[PDB]
Subunit: 289 residues, 4 copies
């Protein structure tokens, strides 16, 4: 079965971005010309995932709901659910248990921005895996902040460590994961770590130990950004602005992606673009069709 | 009488920023490391103004209230009032009539960033002005978007025009205004312009016609920025980032300004910083004391 | 025959960048952390091309020679030749006639930056092409500045126009070209255009008219940037900075590419890095091995 | 006597910016739209200094000479001299001894960028000091890299330390200094420090100990940037670009400054702008007059 369900974890406390996240969800902050959540949303769409559960805080879940609605305007089926407190990424599968049911499911972090040639191609392989799980390894400047994958001399991934003191490599596990149905049972049996969180890295270690984990390499030609600090947030925005100004094309425009994947037709695009044509966003869409 | 009351117009529509501003007020958007409204708030505070009225939309007013509270944490007296519809800058004096009472009052637009050596000094002259009004003239590249001031050969401001098809100069009127109590009656008597808005420029033209308007020059040494477009918003963030990274000092940090102007003392800063010391903002405040 | 020779057109006038380019060649300007010419040089190297001719102005050729030497430090064979006057891109094949001999040859503009996942792969098809030529089509916002390709309903490129008043599409021809040996005779027979230049576009039109031109699409997933204006130059630098800061990996580092493609081995890298280990570039190279 | 002579130290090895400074002097690198040296040059001009000695490396001194000439086109008198090796900032006064003669003299580092309201006013005070010296203290993020000034509780500067291990404050001494004639004798008697350089900080300590040093504060409202790293270089450029795009005015344009200070007239500006009107720089100047 092709993965057809996805969860966007869009909550957290956002303490590092304080005070910008004091009155606005990190996932609603702009990345140049569109809300941050539009990016991970576009990533799932490109992967062919149209049934998506969005999870956020008790305060912000209603806000995403208000901005996105049921997502039928983009040919999607959006559902919402609250995570009482940011107790860990793995909790996404406990909260989303009903939604997931007996199906495979992808997980993408609400602040993750992916961009690059063949990204869709890269995700399809994971989407079509009958069972097991697929995560992606990306070379980053400071491994210590993430789940770090260790490889042997042959290039085989042999272990994963959450925020190691001494990273065994500079390869971090990205915020995009693809799982078969067994992840729900794994999450339910996890016990909090010393830092009191349900670790998704423990989930991934389990798949690895069962020999069911594909650590797909996401090359340097791809861009994987997260907006962890004020600094990285602005760099991400400059990155996006440069590409869009140069190409005259938009990065992660859901309306566009839905149109090109035939989720909606030109008439639907025209209606959505109407209210947005007082600036380039809407004019872009009108021109697109 | 020194101007001791101020109003921040923090509402509006933000069409030029859709869909960014669909689910986030322009004034809540981050400008590098803090919400946009911290800048105009700081500008008033630096002028010695502590009693401030915050006006926004029906939906966003409560959000600013949640973000700022009554402002006592910073030695301020903040109040809030809703602007039913974004019918014009001048409407700020109608909505804020009770708040203003019989006193002088300043108005600053929520998306305006002012920065420069001796900015406090420049404002102090306006703050101490007995009667009449003071506005500021700043040289910009696209004057047509603003209220534009015409000067005669001697350099005396002789007329103002809102968005003229043909600017008589490249000097725009900034979003910081100081008025005496007569502005309230002026606003109550304005008729909407062809574009259906109560024009702050008509108020300024009235003071100028009565010979009561001081058009103070705000030189090139100062930075006056707007964040109405994707472009201006990212440029402002980069601008602020450069300054702060270099100085190790923050631009428009309310806690810091409140401390340096003795609105609050060290213990209060220490108390505010504690629960925030986990992020750089907290560390910044502790280093300060 | 695989394309094993390349030419970098690194001269020109740079009027749009005066006075920046009055005392510094556009190709010597930094793009974040390395001179501009390192990028096109890397592009050729990634295509497996080691024998490269660098063409510049009478004044600047010696500077590039001092910067790059004979390239043996990176397992390359670099040569230099002066372009008396910036009389057109196509003049590159007249000046480089002896260098080319009877072989195939690639041409890359000195101010062109290419980046993206699988870029090497895309070039390899051109590199292996038996005869004819290959150029790349990229979607941009201001096509009028470039050679523009027209496609029919089926998507087949049917015509090219240099700076048309009315672009027939938004696809510009990039600054990376692959040619068979017949390009030399074509260039020697060109007559200057009304703007008095030997047009590379006329050469491309010739291959297209003989049905020997492959117009390969370079998708939105790739970044193709120019640095002809103040604006494009700073945007490119910010673009590169974001990528590198995030990855802890450098874009177009000749030493690294030479190492990864086995042009040189570890000892050589270690020897080059030693005297540079005092700065981050040296540290970067040592970390690499 | 008003200081009427100035020296721009524009040499050094630039190792930190390697490889960008391998084939281009750090002082010829662009800062958005003009060579870096145009900035310190503009600073001396604003201070009323028209007789300036430019010092660089054996290789680059001729390049500045070629770009700037005798500077009479801007109403200046430029002289050039080589510093065999970067043996320290204080060496500027030994090399420039003949040039200085019996007069007072200012020193500005070739990579220093100063900007802010009243900068000229700030410098005039130092320019008019009969004797002694004036340096400026600026709060920076990392004091350790500069000469650091320690102050007592009253705000009086009491000591200076070059690159202290434990900075006694976050105030660094900027790259702009104003001296009376006694600095030449001081420089001649200095002995190299442990790091083998003639320290300008020892010069400044001498003035301080003789009670002849004015440590003028350069407030946070001013911007003082140096382009030490690739990162700071790009931030400086973004800073300049934002201000210029917003104001429609240029920062540190020598042609403009010479015109406004009446060093040259409109006709001279028109002639210089002619060759530069293929881009905004020249058009700016033409419009200016
Ligand atoms: C942990 C945790 C994170 N998040 C989502 C929010 C982010 O988009 C994504 C990334 O993890 P984090 O970035 O670390 O989320 P965070 O906001 O807690 O970061 P910090 O407070 O240190 O600044 O995960 C949740 O929704 N729930 C959670 O329980
Ligand atoms: C390898 C390598 C690639 N490149 C740039 C060239 C391409 O635009 C981009 C991608 O080339 P590719 O390496 O072939 O694509 P990749 O994303 O698979 O890279 P990897 O898996 O090895 O991390 O990287 C370099 O600049 N330096 C290098 O050392
Ligand atoms: C008009 C109007 C503006 N504003 C404040 C919001 C902004 O901070 C400041 C500047 O006004 P504008 O920016 O021009 O109003 P806007 O936010 O609707 O922008 P757009 O053209 O994209 O729709 O004035 C109000 O609060 N109330 C109003 O009635
Ligand atoms: C005049 C002038 C100043 N400057 C820079 C130097 C200072 O850092 C900054 C401000 O110096 P000042 O010009 O004297 O301050 P200002 O803000 O009053 O400028 P004005 O009223 O003339 O618009 O401007 C230039 O770069 N070019 C110029 O032509
Ligand atoms: C024309 C021409 C360009 N060039 C190279 C330089 C650039 O890297 C690349 C792009 O050409 P252009 O950039 O358009 O040439 P230019 O540098 O003169 O730009 P400007 O319009 O500001 O004067 O081609 C040459 O080397 N020789 C030439 O005869
Ligand atoms: C199509 C499409 C892709 N993408 C992003 C997703 C990927 O990171 C990147 C490239 O995916 P791909 O589109 O499949 O790669 P491409 O370079 O071949 O694109 P094309 O030939 O259609 O111009 O573009 C969008 O943001 N919006 C879109 O409408
Ligand atoms: C030391 C020294 C510096 N310089 C000038 C060059 C710079 O504009 C200015 C600033 O000092 P530095 O910046 O440290 O000069 P640098 O190029 O040696 O820096 P680094 O090699 O560590 O990257 O001083 C000289 O001209 N001569 C000298 O002897
Ligand atoms: C003090 C202070 C000023 N400001 C901004 C407001 C002004 O635009 C700019 C300059 O205000 P001023 O402080 O009066 O000018 P300054 O350059 O003399 O500052 P100082 O000597 O104290 O370092 O700094 C803050 O944002 N926060 C602060 O805590």
């Amino acid at each position: 079965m092709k993965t057809r369900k996805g969860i966007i974890l869009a909550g957290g406390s956002g303490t590092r971005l304080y005070p910008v996240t004091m009155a606005v969800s990190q996932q609603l902050l702009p990345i140049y010309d569109k809300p941050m959540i539009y990016y991970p949303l576009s990533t799932l769409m490109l992967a062919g995932i149209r049934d998506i559960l969005i999870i956020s805080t008790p305060q912000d879940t209603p806000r995403f709901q208000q901005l996105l609605g049921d997502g039928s305007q983009w040919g999607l089926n959006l559902q919402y659910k609250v995570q009482p407190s940011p107790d860990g990424l793995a909790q996404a599968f406990i909260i989303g248990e009903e939604f997931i049911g007996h199906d495979d499911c992808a997980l993408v972090l609400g602040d993750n921005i992916f961009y690059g040639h063949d990204l869709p191609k890269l995700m399809e392989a994971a989407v079509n895996k009958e069972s097991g799980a697929t995560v992606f390894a990306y070379h980053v400047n400071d491994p210590e902040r993430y789940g770090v994958v260790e490889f042997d001399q042959k290039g085989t991934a042999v272990s994963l460590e959450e925020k190691p003191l001494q990273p065994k490599s500079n390869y971090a596990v990205t915020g995009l994961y693809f799982y078969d149905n067994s992840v729900v049972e794994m999450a339910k049996n996890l016990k909090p770590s010393a830092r009191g969180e349900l670790e998704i890295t423990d989930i991934n270690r389990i798949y690895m130990e069962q020999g069911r984990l594909s650590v797909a390499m996401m090359g340097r030609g791809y861009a994987w950004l997260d907006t962890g600090t004020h600094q990285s947030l602005i760099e991400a925005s400059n990155f996006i602005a440069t590409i869009e100004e140069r190409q005259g094309l938009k990065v992660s425009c859901p309306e566009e992606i839905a149109f090109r994947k035939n989720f909606i037709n030109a008439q639907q695009v025209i209606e959505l673009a109407g209210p947005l044509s007082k600036n380039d966003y809407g004019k872009y869409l009108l021109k697109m069709v």
